[PDB]
Amino acid sequence: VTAYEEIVCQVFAAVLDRSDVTADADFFALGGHSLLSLRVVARLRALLGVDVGVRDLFEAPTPAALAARLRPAVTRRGPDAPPVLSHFQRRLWLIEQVYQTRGAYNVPLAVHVSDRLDLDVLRAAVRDLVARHEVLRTLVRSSDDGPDPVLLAPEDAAVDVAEVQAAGPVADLLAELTAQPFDLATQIPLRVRMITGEQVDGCVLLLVCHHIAADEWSFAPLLRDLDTAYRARAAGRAPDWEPLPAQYSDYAATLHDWLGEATDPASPLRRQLDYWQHALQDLPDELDLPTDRPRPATASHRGGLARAELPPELVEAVRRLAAQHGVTVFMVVQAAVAVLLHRLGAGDDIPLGSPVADRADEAVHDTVGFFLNTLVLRVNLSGNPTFADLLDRVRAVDLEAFARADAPFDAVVDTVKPPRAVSRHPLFQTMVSYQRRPSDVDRLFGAATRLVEVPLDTAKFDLEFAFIEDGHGGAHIALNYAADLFDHDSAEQLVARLRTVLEHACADPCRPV
Ligand SMILES: *P(=O)(O)OCC(C)(C)[C@@H](O)C(=O)NCCC(=O)NCCS
């Protein structure tokens, strides 16, 4: 859960009165001492629901370490260790068997490069990347028991690297290349394309992963390692690499041993599932949302992307509102989405799905893989509260949920047993997420680089609101909507209405919702 990490940073900043806190910034090296250390733990006791003392601060002086401190550590298995599929990977494989996703679970990463890269050096660098990260060369094959992992040896992993020439606009070409399907039984879950043409200055480098091998937090290590391997291979050498503290299979094995069996009443899995069964009792099948078309018989996973720019002064005001009320920026956005759906007539019981990263362990905090569980965050709006009251409700709901974040979403579904439809995501149909793009990726491959956004043609749910921060200060709200249900202009209006809710909440949070 990254939310613990963000509030620790928030408290460090308020007590040291700085603007310098990263996840690895040492509290004592930052000018903190024991007198202020008690102010930090006193504030953390009030925000988080947990006992914290100077003891914890001493042994875990950074936000990332303190967050993880508040289950065994990942251990490296032997060189002959077989691959292990996490429950995350099994669920994603299962989705691709039930549905025709049309690439909805591919994730793009596109980088504008001022110089055209060398294709032979790039292909060699991708081989180094795939050799380093076993998850990038692990196939999934169907057997009578179910899906089984197949780890390709580095010499046997055929990388897919090619140059493509843009005829029309590159933006639509990026989305087209991104949506191409992976055969997970025969192709490694990574595709690399270098887009060139006379309308593009330099090239656009597009990495496409299937989510089975990468979440959005993998962007930074993917770019960092690809950059290291490219510059090394351009000088004619293999990269000088400190080996990985853990492979994805190590994390999956450690996690599954700890989780246990759902039939074991003492297992963490059963105990967390029992929390969710009670927390999701009498859950609505779906929310009454204003759509343009009824739910079709079959889900097409077609979608679009409506964007709402946020002025830097509004981004700052949302940050200050969160700090003043002791919540994260995500919690403010989550409350705003709940207000929005409430005002649209969805009722007082608003369940919103949200991805939570299981990256607290040092050995996986900055590695490549899929670590996102989906939690159902159930917001109650009865008794017409103020926005400040709602922020208190949302913090309570989120913190109780984050303490049971390891229950796999598919097990929670099978525990809650909701009425199921192939055209409707179970338990929730609106997702809210907070994302931060990599920083310091502006000078990769010895050139000038900048991330470029890919316009999705797909959607996973009815609605996904994302507060997305770029690596350099700015922020915007992206609404990924199901085209089956919503026209583009209705989505543009929805995301504009969310911005208006945020503006009103910052201006005066003491007004009822
Ligand atoms: P804080 O760490 O800034 O300041 C406390 C102190 C360094 C001034 C010091 O006087 C102190 O903590 N002494 C207590 C340490 C101690 O005796 N440990 C208990 C285990 S025997």
Side-chain angles (χ1 to χ4, degrees):
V1 187
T2 313
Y4 297 131
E5 194 184 290
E6 170 175 357
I7 285 177
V8 179
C9 290
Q10 187 172 108
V11 177
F12 279 21
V15 168
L16 298 174
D17 200 5
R18 295 181 70 106
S19 64
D20 212 282
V21 179
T22 72
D24 284 348
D26 181 296
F27 176 77
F28 303 103
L30 220 38
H33 45 77
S34 282
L35 182 52
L36 291 179
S37 86
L38 293 125
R39 278 192 41 82
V40 168
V41 308
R43 181 76 177 143
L44 287 177
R45 291 173 60 86
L47 298 182
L48 316 182
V50 294
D51 194 67
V52 296
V54 193
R55 161 158 88 102
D56 298 301
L57 194 38
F58 279 4
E59 289 294 312
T62 52
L66 186 51
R69 177 174 183 101
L70 301 182
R71 175 174 173 173
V74 176
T75 59
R76 202 242 336 189
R77 298 168 321 146
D80 56 355
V84 180
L85 284 181
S86 71
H87 65 256
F88 305 115
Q89 297 180 293
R90 289 187 184 269
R91 188 176 104 80
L92 290 164
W93 179 86
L94 181 64
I95 291 171
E96 299 283 10
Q97 312 306 308
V98 178
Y99 302 88
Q100 191 103 314
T101 60
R102 301 186 169 76
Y105 287 86
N106 303 348
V107 52
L109 168 61
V111 183
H112 178 84
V113 190
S114 61
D115 288 335
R116 179 182 175 285
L117 292 183
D118 187 303
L119 188 51
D120 294 313
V121 179
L122 176 60
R123 186 175 288 107
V126 172
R127 289 203 247 270
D128 298 321
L129 178 68
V130 165
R132 174 168 175 80
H133 298 277
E134 283 180 2
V135 74
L136 294 181
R137 46 180 164 96
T138 302
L139 306 174
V140 185
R141 296 242 185 96
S142 187
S143 90
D144 57 351
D145 286 352
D148 279 304
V150 172
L151 179 55
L152 293 182
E155 311 86 32
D156 301 322
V159 299
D160 188 355
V161 185
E163 187 173 348
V164 314
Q165 298 191 33
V170 313
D172 288 344
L173 173 62
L174 293 180
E176 188 168 287
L177 294 166
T178 297
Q180 292 179 319
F182 289 91
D183 182 8
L184 299 169
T186 61
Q187 309 169 316
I188 61 165
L190 170 70
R191 224 157 43 218
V192 181
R193 288 301 171 266
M194 179 173 67
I195 289 87
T196 60
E198 311 181 339
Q199 187 121 313
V200 68
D201 307 308
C203 69
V204 182
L205 172 71
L206 174 72
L207 277 62
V208 182
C209 293
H210 193 283
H211 264 312
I212 204 164
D215 61 24
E216 283 77 2
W217 295 116
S218 304
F219 291 170
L222 284 169
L223 285 177
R224 282 192 294 263
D225 285 1
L226 189 63
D227 174 57
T228 299
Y230 184 91
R231 289 181 281 99
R233 286 296 175 187
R237 186 192 56 92
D240 191 357
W241 264 338
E242 56 292 338
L244 286 178
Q247 294 290 339
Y248 190 78
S249 281
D250 300 320
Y251 160 81
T254 297
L255 171 63
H256 285 189
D257 290 353
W258 176 74
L259 276 175
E261 283 271 335
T263 56
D264 176 13
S267 80
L269 176 55
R270 181 69 251 168
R271 287 162 4 202
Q272 293 191 23
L273 284 174
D274 288 331
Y275 167 80
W276 282 110
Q277 183 159 48
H278 214 268
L280 303 183
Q281 194 197 356
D282 300 321
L283 200 68
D285 299 356
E286 69 186 27
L287 292 181
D288 277 356
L289 296 182
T291 56
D292 293 314
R293 283 163 299 275
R295 207 178 281 287
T298 84
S300 74
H301 283 82
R302 291 177 312 107
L305 201 144
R307 219 165 126 270
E309 316 313 312
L310 305 172
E313 296 80 5
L314 176 54
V315 177
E316 280 311 308
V318 163
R319 288 190 185 117
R320 294 196 311 273
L321 178 65
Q324 295 179 357
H325 288 78
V327 299
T328 61
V329 167
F330 164 74
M331 288 172 192
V332 176
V333 174
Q334 176 192 3
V337 168
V339 166
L340 176 56
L341 301 190
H342 179 73
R343 292 191 185 162
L344 294 173
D348 304 336
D349 187 16
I350 309 297
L352 301 173
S354 199
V356 179
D358 183 25
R359 282 179 177 267
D361 193 303
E362 232 186 0
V364 299
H365 187 268
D366 299 287
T367 199
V368 173
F370 190 90
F371 298 85
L372 304 174
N373 201 19
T374 301
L375 307 194
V376 183
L377 306 185
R378 183 181 196 175
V379 193
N380 183 285
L381 280 70
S382 69
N384 194 16
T386 63
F387 196 84
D389 288 344
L390 188 54
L391 291 180
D392 286 344
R393 289 178 186 189
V394 159
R395 187 185 43 231
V397 166
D398 287 0
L399 288 182
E400 293 197 37
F402 295 161
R404 293 90 171 176
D406 311 294
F409 177 74
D410 40 322
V412 171
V413 167
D414 292 314
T415 293
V416 172
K417 294 186 183 309
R420 288 181 230 201
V422 77
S423 47
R424 177 179 68 200
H425 196 281
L427 305 181
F428 71 91
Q429 299 82 39
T430 297
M431 164 161 295
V432 57
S433 69
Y434 171 89
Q435 277 160 64
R436 191 177 19 253
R437 294 291 184 252
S439 298
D440 287 52
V441 294
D442 45 3
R443 290 182 172 283
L444 300 177
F445 320 109
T449 52
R450 59 181 190 88
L451 297 193
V452 300
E453 178 178 294
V454 180
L456 300 180
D457 299 327
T458 58
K460 300 174 203 83
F461 320 100
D462 293 4
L463 300 166
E464 177 173 2
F465 299 91
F467 188 99
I468 302 175
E469 292 201 63
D470 56 29
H472 51 269
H476 68 99
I477 302 172
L479 168 56
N480 188 19
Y481 61 94
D484 288 347
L485 307 176
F486 302 98
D487 295 323
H488 186 79
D489 63 349
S490 311
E492 291 188 313
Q493 290 160 25
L494 270 181
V495 79
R497 286 195 66 176
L498 182 57
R499 198 225 300 103
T500 300
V501 172
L502 286 170
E503 292 165 345
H504 278 99
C506 295
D508 184 10
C510 293
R511 294 192 275 98
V513 311

